[model samples]
Target: FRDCADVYQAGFNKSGIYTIYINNMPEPKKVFCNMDVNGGGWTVIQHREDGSLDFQRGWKEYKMGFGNPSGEYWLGNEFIFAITSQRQYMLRIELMDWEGNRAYSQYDRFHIGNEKQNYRLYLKGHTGTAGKQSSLILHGADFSTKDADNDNCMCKCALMLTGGWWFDACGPSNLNGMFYTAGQNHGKLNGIKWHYFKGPSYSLRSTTMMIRPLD
Candidate 1:
């Protein structure tokens, strides 16, 4: 949250967010919000809260208005509100609360296309707090769950099914599988091909597979 200084492939507070600014456009292209209440209130943010010029906003708050911005909303904070075929555009954000007041801010300039000089911002808030926007958090994966639901959040579970060393490839043992050993075919053991033996000459010997680890 603080400049994202010294971070890596992990999460925050036993859970985390990942901020991947697509094509380095200085903002996130697509971010995953909390699907359920488990990791709720998670957000990607950016703003100056302690700078005496900024405020706090929530990921759950704010509503996108319809049509062109007008009236007090057109000049006050949360001033930017518009919808187009390509995307929604909001500009000139500050903060508005129970007092029903909107404020404005003055920043440098950013350009798009060739002739249009559009400088604006659209902000979001949860409950009541507004203005405090954090950068994108990109903790898109987890080790406990699958990624079928989330297109962004990423994690994988580590596993190995071998234990107690059991093998059964035929009969009820093969059908249910409980016994452990090899040798189901000629010169073969445990479904292994070209298995080696240690018995006398001209004889096949099924090798012993230990159920425990070797020293």
Candidate 2:
């Protein structure tokens, strides 16, 4: 009734777009559900696989969400806050490289604050093959965009990295960063990177950030 987990329990086993209510929102929200990963019931929040979609955006755009749900997209910070505030949720991040290798990271707990709080990120209990390095530096950082400079760094991390994210003095995990083709190097800290999986310069081929009820 509220999220993909509810939809899964309601017997929808296929992965695709589905409408779900969030709290008392008068209008229902359409989201992509991944029903086949890790026992099913995952609400995909962010998904990107090619350079087709643009990730460099302003604060309002990030807050309102963007891209096609069927393709690369960010499910919106407000919507994520609404869902996570309604119930406990766990976060999952999947990544892939151009070499066809895949990796994932999971957190036992995850949630973000409302817009007034600058959509701050809170995460805990990291576990996965991504690496021991763990992109956990963003645990308590506030989300920042090119226009909204909430990061602790002297320079604007969002502007420097060319994307929006929860940056703490410009930490190492920028999933919303600019997309780069394999073998091309921009020589900047701007690339779809999960530093723990691969170095910061190696742009990842794909990534998906999802969440599910703690149950």
CA lDDT of each candidate? Answer: 0.18, 0.88
The C-alpha stretches of model 1 lying farther than 4 A from their native spots are: 1-17, 21-45, 52-115, 121-215
| TM per prediction | 0.17, 0.96
State, as a TM-score between 0 and 1, how close model 1 is to the true structure.
0.17
Provide the RMSD of all predictions against the true structure, rounded to 1 decimal. Answer: 28.0, 1.4
Clashes of 2: 0
Lowest-scoring 10 consecutive residues by lDDT in candidate 1? 206-215
Best by TM-score: 2
User: In model 1, how large is the Cα lDDT of residue 120?
Assistant: 21
